[PDB]
From a paper:
The cpSAP97 PDZ2 protein crystallized in the space group C2 with two molecules in the asymmetric unit. The cpSAP97 PDZ2 protein structure has the typical PDZ domain fold with six β-strands (β1 to β6) and two α-helices (α1 and α2). Interestingly, even after moving β1 from the N-terminus to the C-terminus, the orientations of the side-chains in the Ile317-Ile323 region of the cpSAP97 PDZ2 structure are similar to those in the pwtSAP97 PDZ2 structure. The data show that the circular permutation has decreased the stability of the protein from 4.7±0.03 to 2.4±0.09 kcal/mol.
To learn more about how circular permutation affects folding pathways, we analyzed a protein domain with a relatively complex folding pathway, namely the second Postsynaptic density protein-95/Discs large/Zonula Occludens-1 (PDZ) domain from synapse associated protein 97 (SAP97). SAP97 is a member of the membrane-associated guanylate kinase family, and involved in establishing cell polarity and synaptic potentiation. PDZ domains are usually part of such multi domain proteins and have important roles in molecular recognition. PDZ domains consist of six β-strands and two α- helices ordered in the following way: β1- β2- β3- α1- β4- β5- α2- β6.
Residue numbers in the entry:
A (entry chain B): 13 to 104
B (entry chain A): 12 to 105
The structure:
């Protein structure tokens, strides 16, 4: 990053007991994610580009974030919403 | 994200055959843009999508290039056999 944010969670690395989801835990100031403004700390990462982030390890979630091009398509759910999915496009 | 009517495989870190990083067409949907145009074939090696070279890239990158396409798409493609090596194939999204 790159995109200026950090994540926690993953299978075998649960951020809440019993939940395998990836979560944003840190958003760098004046970084790509921040400058856009849509992404918030606590948001669940559903998918990066065409790679689903449900039931993957933390390492796979990082790999998925590296192997975008400069063009990034994030799918995200806000904590306690819907389920409603939201798309966030970002440039590295 | 897909209206060109085909799927790919291969890529750095996701080789279709050992040692081979190339992107290959592995599926073509009957009735789709690729099918109705008729030039693209299962087995074909995909070299570019518009401005994006696909020589030594991850599968995620190759997919992403095909994701960020508009109405008219330019594909560069390597055909085996006795013809010209590179074929360009332009397609309209359905």
């Amino acid at each position: 990053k790159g995109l200026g944010f950090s994540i926690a969670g993953g299978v075998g690395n649960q951020h809440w007991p019993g939940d395998n989801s990836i979560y944003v835990t840190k958003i760098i100031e004046g970084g790509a994610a921040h400058k856009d403004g849509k992404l918030q700390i606590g948001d669940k990462l559903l998918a990066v580009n065409n790679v689903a982030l449900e039931e993957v390890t933390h390492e796979e979630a990082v790999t998925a974030l590296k192997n975008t091009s400069d063009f990034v398509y994030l799918k995200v759910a806000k904590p306690g919403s819907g389920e409603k999915i939201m798309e966030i496009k970002l440039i590295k």
